[PDB]
């Protein structure tokens, strides 16, 4: 339900890919790990996954 600024990092937890997100217009203290299925940011995921 929130705009995503950028993906900071990626991990696997409990067999799920999770991304650590900076949320647009929120402080870095609000950064959270979210499971990949929670994202609708194809362009960011591909840009992250291509450049990592």
């Amino acid at each position: 339900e929130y705009a995503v600024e950028k993906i900071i990092d990626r991990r696997v937890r409990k067999g799920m890919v999770e991304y650590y997100l900076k949320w647009k217009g929120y402080p870095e203290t609000e950064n959270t790990w979210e499971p990949e299925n929670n994202l609708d940011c194809q362009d960011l995921i591909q840009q992250y996954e291509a450049s990592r």
Binding site: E1, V4, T32, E34, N38, L39, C41, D43
Partner: peptide, 6 residues
Amino acid sequence: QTARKS
């Protein structure tokens, strides 16, 4: 360019 907040 959005995501759900778990």
